[PDB]
Design an enzyme around this catalytic site. Structure first.
Site, PDB file in Angstrom:
ATOM      1  N   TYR A 158     -46.065  21.322  -7.372  1.00  0.00           N
ATOM      2  CA  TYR A 158     -44.808  21.873  -7.757  1.00  0.00           C
ATOM      3  C   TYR A 158     -44.924  22.171  -9.234  1.00  0.00           C
ATOM      4  O   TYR A 158     -45.422  21.365 -10.086  1.00  0.00           O
ATOM      5  CB  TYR A 158     -43.812  21.005  -7.465  1.00  0.00           C
ATOM      6  N   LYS A 175     -36.087 -11.968  -0.827  1.00  0.00           N
ATOM      7  CA  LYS A 175     -34.976 -10.899  -0.800  1.00  0.00           C
ATOM      8  C   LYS A 175     -35.399  -9.590  -1.165  1.00  0.00           C
ATOM      9  O   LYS A 175     -36.747  -9.624  -1.046  1.00  0.00           O
ATOM     10  CB  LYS A 175     -33.985 -11.126  -2.156  1.00  0.00           C
TER      11      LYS A 175
HETATM   12  C1  LIG Z   1     -39.760  19.556   2.030  1.00  0.00           C
HETATM   13  C2  LIG Z   1     -40.620  20.787   2.056  1.00  0.00           C
HETATM   14  C3  LIG Z   1     -39.881  22.032   2.355  1.00  0.00           C
HETATM   15  C4  LIG Z   1     -38.214  22.377   2.102  1.00  0.00           C
HETATM   16  O1  LIG Z   1     -38.120  22.171   0.632  1.00  0.00           O
HETATM   17  P1  LIG Z   1     -36.596  22.188  -0.115  1.00  0.00           P
HETATM   18  O2  LIG Z   1     -36.892  22.355  -1.846  1.00  0.00           O
HETATM   19  O3  LIG Z   1     -36.163  20.761   0.152  1.00  0.00           O
HETATM   20  O4  LIG Z   1     -35.718  23.192   0.617  1.00  0.00           O
HETATM   21  C5  LIG Z   1     -40.501  23.227   2.600  1.00  0.00           C
HETATM   22  N1  LIG Z   1     -41.733  22.981   2.755  1.00  0.00           N
HETATM   23  C6  LIG Z   1     -42.730  22.367   2.637  1.00  0.00           C
HETATM   24  C7  LIG Z   1     -44.256  22.619   2.811  1.00  0.00           C
HETATM   25  C8  LIG Z   1     -42.226  20.777   2.502  1.00  0.00           C
HETATM   26  O5  LIG Z   1     -42.991  19.853   2.424  1.00  0.00           O
HETATM   27  C1  LIG Z   2     -34.141 -12.991  -7.568  1.00  0.00           C
HETATM   28  C2  LIG Z   2     -33.661 -14.262  -8.117  1.00  0.00           C
HETATM   29  C3  LIG Z   2     -34.834 -15.504  -8.369  1.00  0.00           C
HETATM   30  C4  LIG Z   2     -36.255 -15.502  -8.279  1.00  0.00           C
HETATM   31  O1  LIG Z   2     -36.755 -14.960  -9.581  1.00  0.00           O
HETATM   32  P1  LIG Z   2     -38.114 -14.535 -10.066  1.00  0.00           P
HETATM   33  O2  LIG Z   2     -38.144 -14.018 -11.662  1.00  0.00           O
HETATM   34  O3  LIG Z   2     -38.427 -13.612  -8.957  1.00  0.00           O
HETATM   35  O4  LIG Z   2     -39.028 -16.001  -9.791  1.00  0.00           O
HETATM   36  C5  LIG Z   2     -34.183 -16.583  -8.866  1.00  0.00           C
HETATM   37  N1  LIG Z   2     -32.722 -16.741  -8.988  1.00  0.00           N
HETATM   38  C6  LIG Z   2     -31.654 -15.850  -8.709  1.00  0.00           C
HETATM   39  C7  LIG Z   2     -30.445 -16.161  -9.428  1.00  0.00           C
HETATM   40  C8  LIG Z   2     -32.333 -14.660  -8.321  1.00  0.00           C
HETATM   41  O5  LIG Z   2     -31.267 -13.536  -8.017  1.00  0.00           O
END
Ligand SMILES: *Cc1c(COP(=O)(O)O)cnc(C)c1O
Ligand SMILES: *Cc1c(COP(=O)(O)O)cnc(C)c1O
Ligand SMILES: [Cl-]
Ligand SMILES: [Cl-]
Ligand SMILES: [Cl-]
Ligand SMILES: [Mg+2]
Lengths: 386, 386
Positions: free
Chosen positions: A272, A39
């Site tokens: 940031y 899953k």
């Molecule tokens: C993602 C990114 C942006 C735009 O930023 P916002 O806070 O999403 O508007 C601008 N410049 C750089 C260098 C980025 O990586």
């Molecule tokens: C995902 C899942 C499992 C496997 O569980 P683990 O803790 O990862 O071994 C077993 N039974 C159900 C009902 C699940 O959703």
């Protein structure tokens, strides 16, 4: 090694997966099947190649979260039984049967209505079903032995269905207090005894997740559901400390330094918020992973990566696509050097479990939120592919 | 109504995106262009359709995290300029020119080696490049006037390259203290008039992110990089409270109730850890969302969904694929009823921003970590499409 435009990637060690399956196989009773739980894109490791490998090295069936995850595996040429653990809308009954997906269900109305949809389309391909009995998870499944009876009868009366399993889910098998786990076990066996005394023959019975397989292998019944353990990861500290089975981590997450610089001029603000101010001869390496990859922003000024075998800390905030680390005063490092984000390098290690601890979550979450934009490579018989 | 196997989906309102773009266009100087930021799968909204809409409704370029993200847009028919904001390995230089992707760079050596790769191919495509100037982000980019100048000459001399822009990034422009943001502005301008005094003509100049476009629209220069704003989300509570530009949130996250039950029989434990114990007349609803979808596990005994116009609590732990919620004593809710997880329903709202406050993170993380396993539907002119 590998050619990428953006240099972040995951390596899944399928030799490790095989070893986990063998360790579990050798622990639970000889006759018990393993249903490999793939899953959520193989708990973020990639469903297909994990599924394929599992099936060749001791698993018989697969489990998934939805029909769509199951169809992914079909189109990969996988023909083993695939069980959808969650609920599947009556909308998809027809599609499920066509792709030979096994659905879980636990309600009279659902079974009858599933049968009628399939009766209309008239296919000879019956829809396979497991019944989920809720013994305390409180999630899905039928809850009294009398509603269970009705469900069985409705399923057995439905000629376009075919009953292939019945199951429950433990909700505390990874905990030091086993009281609830034993109460659930004994309620499930009880419900099954009830069915048997009405002259009903059982299909495959399965209850153990990784935790219960390890702590209560005597509960394996016909089939266990191996999820977290397949990936070489323990369900809890407790379970690991029992020292009953040796798992090996299959995932590592790596990257290459994109840029290295000594912070010679002002301002020496990093990332940031300017939450980190580097020293004049402090070295700062930039790396192509960030919070949209699944590398928590809560790791800002806190996490650690490996570079030439040592722990170097995250400096300043995690950004959407990148982080910065300090290689220290006049630290050595080049553009292109390999860094491990999760896993091992030389004799250093930053486990997914340590990461989960830092973030007050669990290893299941750290792996299963790794974004699809990070390509996965697989290691088999010691070498790398697709 | 939408048909799905597993009933969880996102709706992205492209009418909202159009208005946000209009609101931003009307606030910044008339002649400034907009680069729409669609890295990280459109901040989890889906890069293709947001980019497509954006380019019809105010944007004339796009930005992405990587070459691979750019190639996704190109395969969907998008032809506009696409800038990679991160670092690209020289291994992707022939590919990037083939697909016409614009690369960020800020290193003399990188310029020459890229020119050299193309030169060998006798390339008839020239690779478009923007120069990143680091004015205090400390992430990527060139940090002195003098290094800036050599970088420019290398690129100008590299005739299989084409210089189409120059930028910097602000690290604190979403804070009430503007000191560092004015220093970065001033430093960038000085670096650019230093070039001009050597007679270098500049291509497209861009510095503003959403926060700087709104609080310092006078810095828009030839082009802004509109990210979070495009999605109808503010970069900070401060920026929002400036009341300068009205943004409309584009994303909602929905599901349908997979099962509804009253907790009559023992045990009344709900989810992993048995951390919640229900009352005997208490109604528990299960929903097909969980932490592998990006619904943080830290919402376990904390989060809220909307059902019939109201706030209903998450009960017990978030699981990988499913959460449970309390509809209270003698509930009112059926299988199939629609639940809003992020977004609005009738009176009520659970905004992306309030989820982010609860998790001590920012709205960016909350949307950009929504798994690709959740299908995205788009609203355009009031109507829904996949
Ligand atoms: C993602 C990114 C942006 C735009 O930023 P916002 O806070 O999403 O508007 C601008 N410049 C750089 C260098 C980025 O990586
Ligand atoms: C995902 C899942 C499992 C496997 O569980 P683990 O803790 O990862 O071994 C077993 N039974 C159900 C009902 C699940 O959703
Ligand atoms: Cl369950
Ligand atoms: Cl994903
Ligand atoms: Cl940057
Ligand atoms: Mg997360």
């Amino acid at each position: 090694m590998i050619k990428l435009c953006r240099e972040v990637w995951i390596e899944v060690n399928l030799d490790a997966v095989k070893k986990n399956l063998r360790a579990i196989r050798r622990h639970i009773p000889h006759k018990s099947k393993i249903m490999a739980v793939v899953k959520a894109n193989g708990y973020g490791h990639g469903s297909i190649e994990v599924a394929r490998h599992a099936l060749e090295h001791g698993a018989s069936e697969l489990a998934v979260a939805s029909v769509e995850e199951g169809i992914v595996l079909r189109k990969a040429g996988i023909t083993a039984p695939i069980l959808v653990l969650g609920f599947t809308s009556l909308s998809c009954v027809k599609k499920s049967a066509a792709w030979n997906i096994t659905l879980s269900a636990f309600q009279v109305d659902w079974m009858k209505e599933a049968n009628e949809i399939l009766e209309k389309e008239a296919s000879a391909n019956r829809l396979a079903i497991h019944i989920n009995v809720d013994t305390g998870m409180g999630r899905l499944g039928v809850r009294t032995k009398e509603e269970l009876l009705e469900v069985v009868k409705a399923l057995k009366a439905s000629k376009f269905l075919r009953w292939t399993g019945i199951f429950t889910h433990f909700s505390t098998a990874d905990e030091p207090d086993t009281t609830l786990t034993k109460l659930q076990h004994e309620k499930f066996i009880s419900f099954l005894s009830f069915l048997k005394k009405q002259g009903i023959e059982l299909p495959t019975v399965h209850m153990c997740n990784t935790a219960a397989a390890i702590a209560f292998p005597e509960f394996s019944a016909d089939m266990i559901r191996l999820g977290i353990g397949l990936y070489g990861l323990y369900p809890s500290a407790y379970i690991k400390q029992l020292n009953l089975v040796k798992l090996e981590p299959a995932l590592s997450l790596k990257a290459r330094i994109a840029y290295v610089k000594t912070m010679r001029t002002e301002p020496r603000t990093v990332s940031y918020g300017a939450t980190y101010i580097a020293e004049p001869n402090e070295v700062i390496a930039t790396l192509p992973i960030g919070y949209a990859d699944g590398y928590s922003r809560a790791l800002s000024n806190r996490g650690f990566v490996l570079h030439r075998g040592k722990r170097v800390p995250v400096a300043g905030r995690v950004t959407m696509d990148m982080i910065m680390v300090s290689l220290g005063e006049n630290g050595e490092g080049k553009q292109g050097d390999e860094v491990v984000i999760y896993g091992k390098q030389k004799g250093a290690e930053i486990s997914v479990d340590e990461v989960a601890e830092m973030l007050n979550t669990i290893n299941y979450e750290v792996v299963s939120t790794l974004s699809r934009r990070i390509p996965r490579f697989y290691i088999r018989d010691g070498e790398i592919f697709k």
